[PDB]
Amino acid sequence: FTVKDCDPNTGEIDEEGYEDEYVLEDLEVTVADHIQKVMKVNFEAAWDEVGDEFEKEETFTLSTIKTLEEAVGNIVKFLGMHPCERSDKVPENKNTHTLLLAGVFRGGHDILVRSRLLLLDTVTMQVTARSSEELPVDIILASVG
């Protein structure tokens, strides 16, 4: 900006004044500015289907902590989607969990996620992102973080 001084009493607004620039804050763009979180038009089918065309994967095996919760903090909250297919709920503890989760991404097509968190007693887990849009499968796996 070109920075101009004020008199608030009665001012002056004149062509001159000199610039300095100040660095502003980052904008990060989310996976929730774009999405409508949903319930499926056809989960059974869709669920699978989305796999069919779309599916990328990441696996981790969890050996120092046996808790979802960290993961959980990043996922419900980052994606802004619904955990489910009756596979959401956990009390202050729970043995196993799946979020098979929903919403639709911008540009029309959908971004779909299944997270099977598996507890043997370590957690090893299958995160699936399946999508009706290509950019989202790679994204979900990242974005969730």
Place this chain on the structure above:
Amino acid sequence: EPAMSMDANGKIIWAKHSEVQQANLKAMGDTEIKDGERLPLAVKDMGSCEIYPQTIQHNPNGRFVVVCGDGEYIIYTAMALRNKSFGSAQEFAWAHDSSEY
């Protein structure tokens, strides 16, 4: 020295003169001239602290200065002319990053 630190826009804001009030900081200038030859300043004080310093150090982005004097540290929010913060020292490091100390 006085206590001053310069924003790379081009304002070395110092304070005081030698024992004058701190009331005097500023300098964005406005003009250009030859290497050997000499230059003009702007005029618009801010400040009129009390504590008498001997350090000025800019924030790592010039920005937040922490100034120590009388043995305590006033940090200023500078443009703000706000006290960014204060306490008593002994010795210092900014976490260079520009976010801790």
